[PDB]
């Protein structure tokens, strides 16, 4: 079995952004949920962007960003335990935003 694409959203505070996301069912305690997170600018493409991983988390603070610009972001998860991994889920639907000027 494979998990459903997680749900993405972007929130702001002053000018510090952050990516938030949730899954369908809460993870079992004896199983970790590995998340692959990536975000870029309309200009570049996914392929050419770094995807930093995280485990059992539902959010990620974002580095400072270029004022006045339009970004993007997607996430996907897999069920892992003791090194055995699950089927990487379909990417979350791409959520985008436009940095404040």
């Amino acid at each position, epitope marked *: 079995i494979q998990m459903a694409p997680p749900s993405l959203n972007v929130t702001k505070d002053g000018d510090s952004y952050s990516l938030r996301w949730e899954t369908m*069912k*809460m993870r*079992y*305690e*004896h*199983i970790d949920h590995t998340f692959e997170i990536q975000y870029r600018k309309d200009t570049a493409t996914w392929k050419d962007s770094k995807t930093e991983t995280l485990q059992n988390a539902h959010s990620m603070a974002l580095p400072a960003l270029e004022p006045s610009t339009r970004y993007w972001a997607r996430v996907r998860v897999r069920t892992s*335990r*003791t090194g055995y991994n699950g089927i990487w889920s379909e990417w979350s639907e791409a959520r985008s935003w436009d940095t404040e000027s």
Partner: antibody, heavy 119, light 112 residues
Framework: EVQLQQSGPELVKPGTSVKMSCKAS????????MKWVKHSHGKSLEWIGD????????LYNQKFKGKATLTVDKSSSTASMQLSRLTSEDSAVYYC????????????WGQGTTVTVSS | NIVLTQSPASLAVSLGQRATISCRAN??????????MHWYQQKPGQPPKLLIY???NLASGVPARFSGSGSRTDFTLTIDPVETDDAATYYC?????????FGGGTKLEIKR
């Protein structure tokens, strides 16, 4: 030593709802899930649901969905559970347990709470 | 919903003898390398206590008389030699695929 102090015995009238608790100690509260179990009289156990004290996450057994709601309060390291629409059949012993994650199960148990539904 | 089945429901074993209890699951409980089957001892008036975790591991504090083994669907909890302190009801609980579940229990009575 891990410690699970549960609330005391309850006598409740049908149709109403109780709200037992369970104070933890002996380890970081948010490091493990709190699991609840219904040990009906003279029988085997029944899982009710777990909760991730960290983000309040929650997962229920479906037979108990809508009956029991699991809550947590970090500042005071207490996990509380609420039972509504109480009836004669809800009369049973309820335990709170702490999880492990290295085996995912009920590693430490509280002494339990005896709820009696009757008029 | 993995349905555990404990056999036999009760048994009277003599002090110093041997006691084996079986627990068979509707479906497999193995995955991610381990078998998510744990055993429990519950003494009258006493909440359950963790006996064996992850099929063969003895919980911190359990006597060397207690041992557990089994894999996909069939598990056996063995107590040898049987003691008086052991007079209790025993449970197996699967944790492979929610809803988590326990067996019907097995109450053994020390013989003497």
């Amino acid at each position: 030593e891990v410690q699970l102090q549960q609330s005391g015995p309850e006598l409740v009238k049908p149709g109403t709802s109780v709200k037992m608790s369970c104070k933890a100690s002996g380890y970081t509260f948010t490091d493990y899930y709190m699991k609840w179990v219904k040990h009906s009289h003279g029988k085997s156990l029944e899982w009710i649901g777990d909760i991730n004290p960290s983000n309040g996450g929650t997962l229920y057994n479906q037979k108990f969905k809508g009956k029991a709601t699991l809550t947590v309060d970090k500042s005071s390291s207490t996990a509380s559970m609420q039972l509504s629409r109480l009836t004669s059949e809800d009369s049973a012993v309820y335990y709170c347990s702490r999880g492990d994650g290295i085996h995912g199960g009920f590693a430490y148990w509280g002494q339990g709470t005896t709820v009696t539904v009757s008029s | 919903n993995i349905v555990l089945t404990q056999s036999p429901a009760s048994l009277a074993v003599s002090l110093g003898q041997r006691a084996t209890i079986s627990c068979r699951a509707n479906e497999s409980v193995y995955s991610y390398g381990d078998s998510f089957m744990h055993w429990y001892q519950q003494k009258p008036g006493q909440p359950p206590k963790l006996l064996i975790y992850l099929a063969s591991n003895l919980a911190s504090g359990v006597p060397a008389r207690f041992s557990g083994s089994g894999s996909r669907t069939d598990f056996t909890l063995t107590i040898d030699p049987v003691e008086t302190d052991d007079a209790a009801t025993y449970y197996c609980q699967q944790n492979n695929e929610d809803p988590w579940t326990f067996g019907g229990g097995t109450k053994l009575e020390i013989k003497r």
